[model samples]
Target: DAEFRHDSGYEVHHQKLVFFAEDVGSNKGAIIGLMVGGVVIA
Candidate 1:
């Protein structure tokens, strides 16, 4: 005689948020940028 049994449980959650700004200013022949949780260029 032989017997086998199996059981399993799984769960998952994912989230993403991003913010950015570009070409914010050019005061003195230069570039400026700002970013938050992301990327930016100016």
Candidate 2:
């Protein structure tokens, strides 16, 4: 069965992570970069 939780505040969380990853210079940050650019948190 499929399961999920519809976020009530995804925008706030996503932005926070994006800012954190923006200045990073490693693969870990790249993953976050992908999320920030690829995923529209709306």
Candidate 3:
């Protein structure tokens, strides 16, 4: 029933998205503040 072609691939990509909520939490927010104007995702 799997559609993906990638070998050994099963994913938590959707679960990965759930971590976005973590980024908004106080701890991660503080980390974000420290990196502001310096950290670049790219």
Quick one: best lDDT, which candidate? 2
- RMSD versus native structure for model 2: 17.5
TM-score of each: 0.19, 0.18, 0.17
Candidate 1's TM-score:
0.19
What ranges in model 3 sit over 4 Å off? 1-9, 23-42
Error of 1 at 36 (Å): 0.6
lDDT agreement of model 2 with the native: 0.55
For candidate 3, write residues 1-42 as lDDT tens digits: 867663345653556564665554455444333444566687
TM-score, prediction 3: 0.17
RMSD (Å) of each candidate, 1 decimal: 20.2, 17.5, 12.1
Better of 1 and 3 by lDDT: 3
Residue pairs in clash, model 1: none
**Which tens-of-lDDT digit does each residue in 1-42 have in candidate 2?**
675654554644545675665755565643333333455676
